[PDB]
Nucleic acid binder design. Structure first.
Lengths: 175, 129, 150, 55, 218, 143
RNA sequence: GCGGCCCCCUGGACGAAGACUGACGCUCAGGUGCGAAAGCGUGGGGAGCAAACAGGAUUAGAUACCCUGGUAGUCCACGCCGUAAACGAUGUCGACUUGGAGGUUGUGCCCUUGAGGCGUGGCUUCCGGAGCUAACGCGUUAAGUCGACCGCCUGGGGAGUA
């Protein structure tokens, strides 16, 4: 249905106000762009989000993590009680990421993808499984995670979600 | 001088699809209306309309599916320099059947599917792909 | 399920002030095995950095192909720069029988049994670019029937 | 312009040393620059105008 | 919602044939946009733009020419939204990565500026650092609190800000442009045939857009 | 002639609204008085007829000069029947052929294409014109 | 290829309205014609310029560049030659395909209220879009999209030679 608009007579009046003969009538073929899908989320946008998120994961920069006890981190400005809640298992992860067996480079990309996905889908808590390694994903991944601005807090996952081989991660989401 | 008005018609349609032209006019003849009726029937043009009395003018309203154009590649096969007359067994299929080839058979101007079904070959005018 | 493979590595040169400087270019193609083909160029000072930039560019910039059962649909000709390329669906015409640098893109593309014959130039950087252009403008019977009504 | 006997008009369209002035200076659409010059030359033959200023 | 009052089109010079569907085009060598075509176009832009504004999205007004400033700062900042009003840096969307660390330096230097150690250790270097806050503040002004790359883009001139349109088309961001008769509908998803360089027209125009961004059901 | 309102005033630049595709910009030289100041403010409806245009409203500063016979410079460009139109500061002047053409002794072609200096005695602001004197011929002819 | 002005004889093009013939058209191997300059033949002419040539310099040398002279030639009539980077290095004819700024030559309409406004043809210049192109660039005067007919190409040299 036609949208509400000024009357055709009113448009003619506007045409009348137009100084001079004041009418343009060039006729040309018209092309209209297809309407964007409501779902959207094109693979290219997803790839871009992933790349943006993984950009923060530097191998040269090592955040100071607590050396005593289970691995944990809380971003400055976030309530310290959040890490405690992660430890107690108050948070139930909605997304699970398995990194075991990936190269560092692959893992960074997947982590980025995970964070992007959490943001997109408004998922606040995710589980990251890195397995057990020395100077491997098990050690490097927490450092990378800390460097990410959207990561609020993480803690060694409870036994139900993989224990010492996994992390629960809290992700900052716009709601 | 104009020596192949059919290839001129197909040129009008290639360059109209290539310029996002809404419709294409040309001088009209019996063979061009026969071909145009085959093209409308097979879904490559939207409509045709022959006007005029003493100088007829065929007008093809063209099709565009998405932003892309429907007539992907129209070629003239049996040009005046060298005419191509195929039998019912030699009668080709274009894009492995996804694209008709307008053959002038004795029964009339048909497609390749329609004339291979009718059991008679003829003069193959154009590939529409 | 990524299925990456490299086609060509070369040593190019630059010719600065003091002597020459030698760089290496990779050219790889990735693809999942069911449409989804990409190629990437990538150039760097050593060979593994070159292939890594090539893979990383090829994982993005990946194009859909409308395959048939395991193969192409209609015969398609793709051209790029000087490199003209024919392909024919070969409805279970067994085995991928294509030229070098076309066997690879058709292999990771997910097609299995087509007939090819590259013509013209057969520089590997332009014979893909003439296979994707080619597989890109090959359309399916549910796309042609979508266009022309039925 | 069309006429050559009007040497007042022609004498406007000529420099102080007898030379025809370009249409780049005086305006004069090219058709009338051509008629002009040809009329100046017919006038210089009749000694209505000078060829130069050192006769 | 109100009928476009006072702009009626412009740009005698460098007009673009792709603007031929939108031109009435009569008076004194200058082209008049058919505003009877603009009103449905602009109502559509308000429709989809309100649709993404209600999904809690980020809009990024783009206002480099004058006087689109501070009208884009006033209109974006009247909403809880973002803007670019000075020179749009080549690649603040397509490498937002590197622009993220420049925004990070703007935050760290304003936190260092009005609260922390600003008078500390030098006068000259302190002056140097403050004018780094003027340069990073006027270039990365509105976008400094975004934290993502935005869900739409609203540019105020399509040919003057072709870079931003080219990047938002590169990234799959809906571009909402007020084109003029010299501009080109490149990849502008929601074209609006209007007037790019009249302050009455862009304040009316951004007034409507900023009205529908924050429009509240309440 | 255009009637506009002043909205933006940034030193050395004045912005006036007219109603076209762009708002004109007028240099303070037109709004400045003989004392060395301005005579307008934001919200004032002034006149502006469009620096090859600001002269139309800049000739008002040449009145205190023509009050004591101010010597200027000009050049003939138009000619009709006994009447000569000279471009003096952009104002058409009037010169009858009372002395311009009379008793031809030789080739009198030193008129069309002459660039000398003329003198003015009386000015007419009611007919937007400036008639040249007659006795000043003793200066323009052979200075 | 054609440059003072005038006369005589003469070819073509373009525009405006109308009338007439009625496909009479397009291309073209062999064939025929025209074809810069230099050159050749016969007869004139010969101011300037100038191959050859001579002298002076320069130079290691200088059969050159530079200087001073200077003959054929350049000019006319008639005949020959038959070629050029004879080049938009782009055969001819026709059709279609976004634009901008000019130039030149017609014609129609509107207050011609001026050195205007709106169109509609012919030829031409510059820049550019899609498209094409190895690239460079071409780009409604195509190197784009087609059709008709002709000419020519097939590694460099030897050789366009015997």
């Amino acid at each position: 249905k036609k949208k509400t608009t000024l009357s055709e007579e009113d448009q003619a009046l506007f045409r009348q106000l137009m100084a001079g003969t004041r009418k343009i009538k060039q006729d040309t073929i018209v092309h209209r762009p297809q309407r964007k899908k409501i779902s959207e989320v094109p693979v290219k946008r997803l790839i871009q989000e992933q790349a943006d998120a993984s950009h923060y994961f530097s191998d040269e920069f090592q955040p100071l993590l607590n050396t005593e006890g289970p691995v944990k981190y809380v971003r400055p400005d976030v309530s310290h009680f959040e890490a405690k809640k992660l430890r107690r298992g108050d948070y139930s992860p909605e997304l699970f990421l398995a990194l075991a067996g990936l190269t560092q480079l692959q893992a960074k990309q997947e982590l980025g993808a995970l964070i992007a996905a959490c943001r997109r889908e408004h998922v606040f808590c995710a589980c990251v499984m890195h397995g057990h390694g020395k100077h491997i994903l098990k050690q490097q991944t927490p450092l990378w995670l800390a460097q990410h601005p959207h990561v609020m807090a993480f803690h060694q996952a409870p036994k139900e979600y993989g224990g010492d081989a996994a992390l629960l991660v809290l992700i900052e989401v716009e709601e | 001088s104009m020596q192949d008005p059919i290839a001129d018609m197909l040129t009008r349609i290639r360059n109209g699809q290539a310029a996002n032209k809404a419709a294409v006019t040309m001088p009209s003849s019996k063979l061009k209306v026969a071909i145009a009726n085959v093209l409308k029937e097979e879904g490559f043009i939207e409509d045709f309309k022959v006007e005029g009395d003493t100088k007829p003018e065929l007008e093809l309203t063209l099709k565009y599916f998405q932003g892309k154009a429907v007539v992907e590649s129209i070629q003239r096969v049996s040009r005046p320099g060298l005419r191509i007359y195929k039998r019912k067994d030699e009668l080709p299929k274009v894009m492995a059947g996804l694209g008709i080839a307008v053959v002038s058979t004795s029964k009339g101007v048909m497609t390749d599917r329609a004339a291979r079904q009718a059991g008679l070959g003829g003069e193959i005018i154009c590939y529409v792909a | 399920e990524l299925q990456e493979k490299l086609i060509a590595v070369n040593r190019v040169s630059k010719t600065v002030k003091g002597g020459r400087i030698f760089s290496f270019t990779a050219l790889t193609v990735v693809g999942d095995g069911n449409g989804r083909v990409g190629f990437g160029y990538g150039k760097a000072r050593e060979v593994p950095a070159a292939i890594q930039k090539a893979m990383e560019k090829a994982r993005r910039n990946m194009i859909n192909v409308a395959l048939n059962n395991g193969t192409l649909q209609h015969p398609v000709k793709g051209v790029h720069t000087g490199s003209r390329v024919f392909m024919q669906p070969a409805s279970e015409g067994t085995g991928i029988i294509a030229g070098g640098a076309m066997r690879a893109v058709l292999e990771v593309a997910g097609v299995h049994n087509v007939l090819a014959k590259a013509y013209g130039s057969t520089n590997p950087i332009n014979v893909v670019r003439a296979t994707i252009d080619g597989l890109e403008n090959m359309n399916s019977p549910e796309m042609v029937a979508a266009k022309r009504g039925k | 312009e069309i006429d050559y006997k009007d040497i007042a008009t022609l004498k406007n369209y000529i420099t102080e040393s007898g030379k025809i002035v370009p249409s780049r200076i005086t305006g004069t659409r090219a058709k009338y620059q051509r008629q002009l010059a040809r009329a100046i030359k017919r006038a210089r033959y009749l000694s209505l105008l000078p060829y130069t200023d050192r006769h | 919602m109100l009928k476009a009052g006072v702009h009626f089109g412009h740009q005698t010079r460098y007009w673009n044939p792709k603007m031929k569907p939108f031109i009435f085009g009569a008076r004194n060598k200058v082209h008049i946009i058919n505003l009877e075509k603009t009103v449905p176009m602009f109502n559509e832009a308000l429709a989809e733009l309100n649709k993404i504004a209600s999904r809690k999205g980020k809009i990024l007004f783009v206002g480099t020419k004058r006087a689109a400033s501070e009208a884009v700062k006033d209109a974006a900042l009247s909403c809880d939204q973002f803007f670019v009003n000075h020179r749009w840096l080549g690649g603040m969307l397509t490498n937002w990565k590197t622009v993220r660390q420049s925004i990070k330096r703007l935050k760290d230097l304003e936190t260092q500026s009005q609260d922390g150690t600003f008078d500390k250790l030098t006068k000259k270097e302190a002056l140097m650092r403050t004018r780094e806050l003027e340069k990073l503040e006027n270039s990365l002004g509105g976008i400094k609190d975004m934290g993502g790359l935005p869900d739409a883009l609203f540019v105020i001139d399509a040919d003057h800000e072709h870079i931003a349109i080219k990047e938002a088309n590169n990234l799959g961001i809906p571009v909402f442009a007020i084109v003029d008769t010299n501009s080109d509908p490149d990849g502008v998803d929601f074209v609006i045939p209007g007037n790019d360089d009249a302050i009455r027209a862009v304040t009316l125009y951004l007034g409507a857009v900023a009205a529908t961004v924050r429009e509240g059901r309440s | 002639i255009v009637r506009g309102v002043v909205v933006a005033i940034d030193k050395d630049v004045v912005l006036v609204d007219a109603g076209l595709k762009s708002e004109s910009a007028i240099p303070a030289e037109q709004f400045k008085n003989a004392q060395g100041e301005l005579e307008i403010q934001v919200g004032d409806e002034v006149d502006v007829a469009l620096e090859k245009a600001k002269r139309h409203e800049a000739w008002i500063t040449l009145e205190k000069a023509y009050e004591d016979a101010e010597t200027v410079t000009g050049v003939i460009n138009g000619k009709v029947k006994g009447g000569f139109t000279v471009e003096l500061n952009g104002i058409r002047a009037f010169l009858p052929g009372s002395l311009v053409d009379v008793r031809p002794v030789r080739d009198t072609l030193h008129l069309e294409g002459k660039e000398l200096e003329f003198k003015v005695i009386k000015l007419d602001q009611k007919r937007n014109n400036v008639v040249v004197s007659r006795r000043a011929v003793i200066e323009s002819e052979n200075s």
